[PDB]
Design a protein around this ligand. Structure first.
Ligand SMILES: *[C@@H]1O[C@H](CO[C@@H]2O[C@@H](C)[C@@H](O)[C@@H](O)[C@@H]2O)[C@@H](O[C@@H]2O[C@H](CO)[C@@H](O[C@@H]3O[C@H](CO[C@H]4O[C@H](CO)[C@@H](O)[C@H](O)[C@@H]4O[C@@H]4O[C@H](CO)[C@@H](O[C@@H]5O[C@H](CO)[C@H](O)[C@H](O)[C@H]5O)[C@H](O)[C@H]4NC(C)=O)[C@@H](O)[C@H](O[C@H]4O[C@H](CO)[C@@H](O)[C@H](O)[C@@H]4O[C@@H]4O[C@H](CO)[C@@H](O)[C@H](O)[C@H]4NC(C)=O)[C@@H]3O)[C@H](O)[C@H]2NC(C)=O)[C@H](O)[C@H]1NC(C)=O
Ligand SMILES: *[C@@H]1O[C@H](CO[C@@H]2O[C@@H](C)[C@@H](O)[C@@H](O)[C@@H]2O)[C@@H](O[C@@H]2O[C@H](CO)[C@@H](O[C@@H]3O[C@H](CO[C@H]4O[C@H](CO)[C@@H](O)[C@H](O)[C@@H]4O[C@@H]4O[C@H](CO)[C@@H](O[C@@H]5O[C@H](CO)[C@H](O)[C@H](O)[C@H]5O)[C@H](O)[C@H]4NC(C)=O)[C@@H](O)[C@H](O[C@H]4O[C@H](CO)[C@@H](O)[C@H](O)[C@@H]4O[C@@H]4O[C@H](CO)[C@@H](O)[C@H](O)[C@H]4NC(C)=O)[C@@H]3O)[C@H](O)[C@H]2NC(C)=O)[C@H](O)[C@H]1NC(C)=O
Lengths: 207, 207
């Protein structure tokens, strides 16, 4: 029978009023014999009607995939409203229901600390600039790096890790040529999170 | 029908000859009617006989879970031999086969760097001692902390993260009372990985 997957908005999309956050309800394994698919959408159990549903699209394995997109209000998501997708198809004994929302719990402000390269790493051609982000809740977060107002791209960021006090932490690693670090250039780690003022902070690192 | 999932040994277990690494074949969706299941195990296709089946454990959805554990030899795993679990059950038209082995490729030695707490962090009652481990392959690794020869309890380690050159990195965070750090206690990050001499290195951190 068909399967339903419900996807949350991206962390950045709920934190910036200029962006447009969406919840996305995807149904796969829709058969040819019962290809009609109905979507109902509920917000805290109250039905809403503004979703945009796409025409079904046959896949190379001869099943259909159908997508419904519900735009959410930033403050609704951050207030913890629950979004329910109900998917009806004639091949199903009963409609499939999925629900998604922000992780429950009291938001906690991320603490952002930058850590310079270790002495021992300075023997190499490239060095590691570290951004520790700890004590935050929920785990939805975005982390970026820049220098002189331009985005540094050569970075990797670990997944959030559940810490022992129930908050989350992560590290981001930016790799730069040691000359750039030794020339005294200024590097900034940027963090977006609902519990930060203006949903954003940056912390600077340099020699 | 039932499903079979096959799990590798813990990284520490294969790296230390005193420990006993095992490959684990887990079978779920075993019915309440006739919950017997037979295991065959092969190492590079040669049948072995030292596996043990654990007691059945029924689940909250009225299914059983059945586990078979095969002890493996340290170099067999490290040399990339393939372990095959064959699961036979009356509900199967034909036996299920799953196969597992170590990630393929040239092992690479971890670089281990300890990073002291940020200046900004010293206002807190506890501080974060960081161990960056980068450039290793495969991703199987174990990290521990100690001080004065005894194991520290309050640490967390991120999962390995694929770096842009195809190696892995991670960070480990040890949280200590700021007093212990300011009194100049020496703290050590321990790393176990197959590409290290004696499968082990230690790097120390202090004020
Ligand atoms: C027939 O074909 C179809 C189509 O496949 C395509 O065509 C065929 C012919 C092939 O060529 C194939 O190569 C093609 O891809 C097959 O359809 C697939 O079916 C499987 C299930 O069988 C689906 O698997 C799930 O995938 C989820 C992840 O999906 C995303 O990521 C993958 C990449 O990994 C993408 O391929 C998908 O398209 C999804 O991409 C996401 O799409 C979102 C919606 O558009 C995006 O979000 C939106 O994005 C916009 C911007 O674009 C905005 O930001 C919006 O705000 C935002 O909403 C999102 O960005 C994008 N992500 C990425 C990374 O690109 C998995 O999450 C899921 O795993 C869960 O479920 C498993 C059980 O199935 C479970 O085991 C997992 O652990 C995980 O479990 C969940 O986790 C917790 C558990 O506590 C719970 O919360 C959940 O309840 C739990 N789940 C359950 C069920 O309990 C699945 O693995 C696959 O996605 C789907 N593909 C497509 C393209 O739809 C079909 O299977 C084929 N059939 C047969 C018989 O062969
Ligand atoms: C009825 O219920 C049962 C029971 O469910 C559970 O129990 C009840 C009481 C409820 O509480 C319920 O909510 C619970 O969920 C259901 O049984 C479940 O069945 C599903 C499948 O339907 C299983 O899902 C797979 O899980 C895999 C991971 O499982 C491990 O991790 C989870 C983490 O939550 C644990 O819960 C599991 O127990 C497993 O834990 C591991 O167990 C190992 C064995 O002991 C441990 O290793 C050993 O440990 C010792 C101690 O260290 C020694 O070290 C040994 O030496 C060592 O070997 C291991 O440490 C331990 N890990 C952890 C973290 O604890 C997933 O991998 C798997 O995903 C597969 O399928 C997905 C489907 O979408 C797919 O998306 C995935 O990608 C993945 O397979 C992928 O396949 C493709 C193709 O190759 C690849 O692209 C991918 O790379 C590949 N893998 C990955 C990772 O991408 C499933 O999610 C579930 O595990 C199982 N639960 C249990 C407890 O067994 C049953 O299904 C229900 N029936 C029905 C009809 O609903």
């Amino acid at each position: 029978g068909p399967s339903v997957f419900l996807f949350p908005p991206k962390p950045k999309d709920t934190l910036m009023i200029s962006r447009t956050p969406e919840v996305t309800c995807v149904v796969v394994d829709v058969s040819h014999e019962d290809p009609e698919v109905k979507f109902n959408w509920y917000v805290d159990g109250v039905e809403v009607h503004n979703a945009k549903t796409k025409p079904r699209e046959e896949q190379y394995n001869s099943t259909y995939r159908v997508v419904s997109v519900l735009t959410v209000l930033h403050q609704d998501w951050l207030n913890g409203k629950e979004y329910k997708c109900k998917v009806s198809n004639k091949a199903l004994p009963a409609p499939i229901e999925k629900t998604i929302s922000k992780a429950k719990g009291q938001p906690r402000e991320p603490q952002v600390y930058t850590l310079p390269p270790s002495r021992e790493e300075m023997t190499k051609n490239q060095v590691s600039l570290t951004c520790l982000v700890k004590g935050f809740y929920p785990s939805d977060i975005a982390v970026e790096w820049e220098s002189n107002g331009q985005p540094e791209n050569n970075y990797k960021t670990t997944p959030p890790v559940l810490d022992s006090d129930g908050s989350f932490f992560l590290y981001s690693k930016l790799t730069v040529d040691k000359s750039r670090w030794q020339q005294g250039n200024v590097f900034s780690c940027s963090v977006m999170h609902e519990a930060l003022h203006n949903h954003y902070t940056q912390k600077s690192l340099s020699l």
